Amino acid sequence: STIEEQAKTFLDKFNHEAEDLFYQSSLASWNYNTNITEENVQNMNNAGDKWSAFLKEQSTLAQMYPLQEIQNLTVKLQLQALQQNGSSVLSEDKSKRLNTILNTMSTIYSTGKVCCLLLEPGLNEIMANSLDYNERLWAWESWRSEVGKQLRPLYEEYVVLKNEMARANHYEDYGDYWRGDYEVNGVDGYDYSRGQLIEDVEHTFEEIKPLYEHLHAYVRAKLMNAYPSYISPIGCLPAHLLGDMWGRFWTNLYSLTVPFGQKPNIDVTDAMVDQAWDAQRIFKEAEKFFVSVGLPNMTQGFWENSMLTDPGNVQKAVCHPTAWDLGKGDFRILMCTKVTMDDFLTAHHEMGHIQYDMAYAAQPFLLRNGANEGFHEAVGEIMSLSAATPKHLKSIGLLSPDFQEDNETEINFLLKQALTIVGTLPFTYMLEKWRWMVFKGEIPKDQWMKKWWEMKREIVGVVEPVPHDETYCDPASLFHVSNDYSFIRYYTRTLYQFQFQEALCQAAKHEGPLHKCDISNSTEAGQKLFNMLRLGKSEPWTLALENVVGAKNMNVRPLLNYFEPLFTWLKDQNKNSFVGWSTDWSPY
Amino acid sequence: QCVNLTTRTQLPPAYTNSFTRGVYYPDKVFRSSVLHSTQDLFLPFFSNVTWFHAITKRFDNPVLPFNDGVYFASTEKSNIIRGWIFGTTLDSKTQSLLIVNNATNVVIKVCEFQFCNDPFLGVYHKNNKSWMESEFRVYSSANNCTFEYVSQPFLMDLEGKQGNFKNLREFVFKNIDGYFKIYSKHTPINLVRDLPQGFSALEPLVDLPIGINITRFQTLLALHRSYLTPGDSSSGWTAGAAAYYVGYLQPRTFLLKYNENGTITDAVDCALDPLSETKCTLKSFTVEKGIYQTSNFRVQPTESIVRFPNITNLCPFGEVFNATRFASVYAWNRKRISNCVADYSVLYNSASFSTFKCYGVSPTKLNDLCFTNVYADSFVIRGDEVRQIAPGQTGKIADYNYKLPDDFTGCVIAWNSNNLDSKVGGNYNYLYRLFRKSNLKPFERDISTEIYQAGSTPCNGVEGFNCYFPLQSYGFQPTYGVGYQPYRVVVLSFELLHAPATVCGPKKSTNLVKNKCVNFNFNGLTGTGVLTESDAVRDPQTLEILDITPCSFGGVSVITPGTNTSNQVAVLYQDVNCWRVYSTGSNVFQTRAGCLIGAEHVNNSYECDIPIGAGICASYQT
Ligand SMILES: *[C@@H]1O[C@H](CO)[C@@H](O)[C@H](O)[C@H]1NC(C)=O
Ligand SMILES: *[C@@H]1O[C@H](CO)[C@@H](O)[C@H](O)[C@H]1NC(C)=O
Ligand SMILES: *[C@@H]1O[C@H](CO)[C@@H](O)[C@H](O)[C@H]1NC(C)=O
Ligand SMILES: *[C@@H]1O[C@H](CO)[C@@H](O)[C@H](O)[C@H]1NC(C)=O
Ligand SMILES: *[C@@H]1O[C@H](CO)[C@@H](O)[C@H](O)[C@H]1NC(C)=O
Ligand SMILES: *[C@@H]1O[C@H](CO)[C@@H](O)[C@H](O)[C@H]1NC(C)=O
Ligand SMILES: *[C@@H]1O[C@H](CO)[C@@H](O)[C@H](O)[C@H]1NC(C)=O
Ligand SMILES: [Zn+2]
């Protein structure tokens, strides 16, 4: 018969038993995570191998169908996501070499010492709390020498292998292969191009440039109190003095720099202890909030299958918080719940993830995901942003019934949030641009370190303490760089989340600053959000974005509106101090 | 003790007319400003009731039959009437009910009273003006007693009055299903004799669950004795003036009127006169000028009977519902049941089913019916697709596993089964068809396992490209969601044919009668009229054909000039040549349309006001 009918029949056959194998593998993984033992490891490995083999067989079979005949625009999406030859293009010896390289990279990153003195148990503690210039510099240099110097030729071979594979996959470069995610075709007025993604990022980055410059100048001025002999009045900040091994986040710097230290921060730990919350009232409150918004209930199986506390000393289990969608209408949450405000917010985040998973379950198997890689975390995070407001806490009985808010505390909260929200955008942009350029081959193999440090001095505005030669490979010290993880998602996630927050606050008929906005008891906002949540991956992400904000593309203006009072305060404080950094200055 | 009263003058019985009395509330439902037509046991209007006096002495207290309930009106001035006795023989051999009202309480007893020949209550002293109860000669003894009630103590005046009757007490006594229903009403009156006119709604008084056989009854009075009544007990007493009217209720239809206050204000007898029948049919108190033919000559059918086939076998539903295992949906279990009595009420109210939907038949009305056959079709499906088992629905199940006809006439039951056939690892025993060349005709079963081919090239019994196994397998686990948990589905289909019914609801078969206006129910179909041994019905007990004659006949027409204009009406018999008439009367005129009574025929010819037929036109004049 027609190719379309055969394709539909094949997809109908596939989805059945695709759901089954996926459910069995997910159940094995959940059993291993909740109950760690060798037998569970064997079961998980067997299930994963079976699922992978089935996926390979199905892709091989689906390769026969030509994509030109299909004109349904929904079968085409599933086939395109299915017709992924991928790593099978490389030779068997080449594939083995690539797998060995990746395994060695993972092992060497996991196993790293500078003594004894491992990374997680003590190196992060030093980088966050040493406070000594010499100790921090020594730890930074030791880690760099131990990791980047060794990981150079392995990374070079990895780069050439992956670029060759991407070229063999009818792609210009591996960067193009990554950017292919943000691509939609065949829709008039909504289609997107891979080459469009490299642009439209630098534009919004330049839009927030003055705000980042003011924040950096203020941080430099405030930090001059400590290490008086190491901070220049004009210049780039020393790399190791960011409170992080890489400076990705500036949260730990909040202790040093506060505008009004007398004003205490908002905390509810004492209230939680006094009210004696039993590690289950938190999820009850989260469910009540999500219901009040207008979103559906929580399934009965969620309240008994999922575990929401430590099993005890008898049974061990890694409990990094996670939201599990096992399929066939099964939903779980894995957490070690404790009585903290952070636990409250993260429980709200995971409940938001679960709600998002519930929304699109009616779609076929191939289209059960977010619109792109950036939607899911933003949807999970806007809930925590909305539930973090002092007004929402005051609505609950945990907060004081008679509380007064001052703009000093608002400025403190905004500064603490901005130290994390905007302190990572330039670094993310710089790192992804460097990786894109490396993959494109513009940068010679003998100019990696020089170009990297030039970008760090220019874009990020942070200078290294000591010079390094081409032997070192500093960016390879990052977890995502060495483990083949796309990294642009952490950039667009904030943009999407703030656009969604602005749209919901406008639709909920709220007045005042954006940071004092809550969306509870707003049925219209819930319905509008559901009208996008229920789409899944079926529609192009541009159309889904238009269904909430109303704009085809992302706009950074809501982010600026969010930090506008802090922007004015920073301008007032910096009216006397210098703004900018000196590129030529160096610590040595 | 018991004494036979003497020195009583005997007089012939007297009779009077019931001027629109004896109207009680048929039920306890509040109705305001509404006309309600209802049939029950009521005293017909302007009936001939019996009058008894107490004043010559004339101490009348005979024994009268209790046929279908008694309407008792009492005109009193000193409460001479003391109570009543009901029963069958009233000689302690049968259970008898005594309802008495002495000077202290009200005693309602149901015992085998050895009633006296002349029961009475001989209650005065010259030296002190005071009247007290002194004599109570009702029953010799009471051996076995079932029901006994005593009212709260009260003081009775017991004083005679020299004025006219001031109390009118109206009571209605009925004995239905062993329940003695008494309706009571009191009215202050000022009259010498005769039944007063007007309207009065009787309110319910009591409903005693006595459960006894009542055939006869008698009224118990009061006696007054003092120094002015010399002699023995049988002669030294007086009577005291009082009166009472006795009538019998009949099964009739009445049109009751409710005002804005919810009380009964007016009553209309429905099978009394042709005008009354027209008013009842139009459900209004005003009838405009015109011609009307309501049913036939007036008649209220006596009783109702039911005749259902006799199959005392309990019908086996527990075999199907409480079965060990159920078959797959692609090969669904069919069972046929007949010659059994099914109690659908317990099935409908078992309170353990997730879905119970009956299509084309009311869930409760199907209990008392008759069906030729019943089909029970059982299987197990997924929670999402349970909604697909319904006429006019489309889906995988509705097109490849189980097809339901559009004109369905049965019921669908489905309940959760996650505790029986759900095991860890997957109950890979339930299959379902996923690929089929064509659709399914209603009520079709296919178990073919031939591999489906979707491409051009035929595969010779081998799987591969464009060739798939037709039957897929469900997986069941105790950790799936509600939408994926197994559900057990049973569809009941009712089959009706001209053959004698084999399945019928639990009811009774009452002895049949002939040549009587009865409301009959044969095998679930109801009708009214007279059954004649020979439209025609074949009873399930003797297979004898009985013809249904519509009781009263003769097409009767009524001509009226409007209720507001006048109450004069003309009666036309279309099949009578001038016989069977309400009353011959006068103005008897014979035309091609028939015999007309009550309309004057003139030698002139005016414009046609009220057409009748064959060029005849009539009008109301001076
Ligand atoms: C974890 O697995 C071990 C393996 O024998 C078992 O004994 C134990 O009960 C399991 N714990 C659970 C299921 O909580
Ligand atoms: C694609 O096929 C599906 C069948 O499931 C149908 O519902 C949908 O309308 C079709 N869309 C187009 C554009 O043909
Ligand atoms: C994967 O293999 C198929 C089959 O030859 C081929 O058509 C496709 O181009 C391959 N994918 C590549 C080379 O990226
Ligand atoms: C579903 O949500 C409503 C909303 O108030 C609630 O009343 C009801 O109890 C919930 N049911 C379940 C099973 O969660
Ligand atoms: C903000 O806080 C400062 C802190 O002293 C206070 O003087 C001022 O009145 C507050 N409000 C505004 C609008 O600046
Ligand atoms: C939402 O409505 C509930 C219903 O009474 C109320 O208790 C709660 O305080 C409301 N919250 C907000 C933020 O309006
Ligand atoms: C089936 O078993 C239940 C469980 O006791 C019982 O109540 C019921 O009467 C049985 N029969 C039917 C027809 O449900
Ligand atoms: Zn998350």
Q: Where are the domains of chain B?
A: 14-268, 318-495
Q: Name the H helices within A111-188.
A: 124-129, 133-147, 152-168, 174-179
Q: Is residue A480 annotated as part of the catalytic site, yes or no?
A: yes
Tokens of B91: 């000689």
Interchain contact, A1 vs B456, CB within 8 Å: yes
Q: Distance, in angstroms, between B424 CA and closest chain A CA?
A: 11
> Any bridge partners for residue A437, and if so which?
none
Tokens of A550: 């109303």
Residue type for A98, please?
Answer: L
> Any bridge partners for residue B611, and if so which?
B617
Tokens of A353: 């993830």
Mutation choice for B interface testing from A23, A306, A324 by most B CBs within 10 A? A23
DSSP A122: I
Residue B428 forms contact with A (CB below 8 Å):
no
CA end-to-end span of chain B, whole Å?
Answer: 71
Q: How far is CA B440 from CA A127, B218, B331, B437, in A?
A: 72, 76, 14, 10
Report the separation in Å between the CA atom of B457 and the middle of ligand 1, taken as the mean of its atom positions: 52
Distance in angstroms (rounded) separating the CA atoms of residues A362 and A358: 9
Q: Which helix (H) or strand (E) holds B206?
A: strand B201-209
Quick one: CA dihedral B363, B365, B367, B369, positive or negative? negative
Quick one: CA dihedral A434, A435, A441, A447, positive or negative? positive
Interchain contact, A13 vs B475, CB within 8 Å: no
A565: left (phi over 0), alpha (psi -120 to 50) or beta: alpha
Q: Which helix (H) or strand (E) holds A416?
A: helix A407-421
Angle of helix A152-168 relative to helix A425-440, nearest 10 degrees, comes to: 70
- Which residue's alpha carbon is nearest to atom 13 within ligand 1? A35
State how many domains chain A has. 1
- Which of B622, B488, B530, B569 is closest to B273 using CA atoms? B569
Q: How far is CA A353 from CA A360, A365, A508, A520, in A?
A: 12, 18, 22, 17
Q: Ligand 7: which of B319, B321, B488 to mutate, judged by most atoms within 8 Å of the beta carbon?
A: B321
CATH 3.40.50.300 assigned to domain B14-268? The reply is no
Q: Is B394 exposed, middle or buried (0-12, 13-18, 19+ CB in 10 A)?
A: exposed
List, as own/partner pairs, every contact residues A360-363 make where C-beta atoms lie below 8 angstroms and the sequence separation is at least 24, other chains included. A360/A533, A360/A534, A360/A535, A360/A536, A360/A537, A361/A329, A362/A534, A363/A536, A363/A537, A363/A538
Asked if A259 and A221 touch (Cβ cutoff 8 Å), the reply is no
Angle of helix A281-293 relative to helix A375-387, nearest 10 degrees, comes to: 100
Domain containing A331 equals 1-588
CA atoms within 13 A on the CB side of A56: 10
Report the separation in Å between the CA atom of A298 and the middle of ligand 4, taken as the mean of its atom positions: 8
- Which of A229, A320, A215 is closest to A257 using CA atoms? A215
Asked if B265 and B199 touch (Cβ cutoff 8 Å), the reply is yes
Residue A300 forms contact with B (CB below 8 Å):
yes
3-class secondary-structure state, position B591: strand
Q: Distance, in angstroms, between B520 CA and closest chain A CA?
A: 55
Q: Which residues contact B425 (CB under 8 A, 6 or more apart)?
A: B477
- Which of A168, A176, A109 is closest to A143 using CA atoms? A109
CB atoms closer than 10 angstroms to residue A111: 9
Q: Is residue A350 annotated as part of the catalytic site, yes or no?
A: yes
A-facing residues of B in 452-491 (CB < 8 A) are 454-456, 465-466, 468, 472, 475, 477, 479-484
Looking at B270-327, which runs of residues are DSSP E strands?
A: 290-292, 303-307
DSSP B548: E
Asked if B105 and B79 touch (Cβ cutoff 8 Å), the reply is no
The CATH class given to the B318-495 domain equals alpha beta
Q: How far is CA A229 from CA A137, A224, A588, in A?
A: 15, 9, 12
> Any bridge partners for residue B187, and if so which?
B168
Q: Distance, in angstroms, between A330 CA and closest chain B CA?
A: 6
Report the separation in Å between the CA atom of B358 and the middle of ligand 4, taken as the mean of its atom positions: 28
- Largest Cα–Cα distance of chain B, in whole Å? 129
CA end-to-end span of chain A, whole Å?
Answer: 75
Nearest ligand atom owner, CA of A260: 5
**C-alpha angle B130/B133/B135, rounded to 5°?**
135
Q: Is A303 annotated as a binding residue?
A: no
- Which of A392, A353, A126 is closest to A245 using CA atoms? A126
Interchain contact, A5 vs B454, CB within 8 Å: yes
Distance in angstroms (rounded) separating the CA atoms of residues B613 and B606: 15
Q: Which helix (H) or strand (E) holds A379?
A: helix A375-387
**C-alpha angle A394/A376/A159, rounded to 5°?**
135
3-class secondary-structure state, position A61: helix
Q: Which helix (H) or strand (E) holds B118?
A: strand B106-120
- Which of B205, B37, B210, B59 is closest to B120 using CA atoms? B59
Asked if A538 and A74 touch (Cβ cutoff 8 Å), the reply is yes
Distance in angstroms (rounded) separating the CA atoms of residues B595 and B597: 7
Residue of B nearest to A12 (CA): B434
Distance in angstroms (rounded) separating the CA atoms of residues B276 and B279: 5
- Closest Cβ opposite residue A328 in set B434, B435, B480: B480
Asked if A512 and A471 touch (Cβ cutoff 8 Å), the reply is no
Tokens of A187: 């829709």
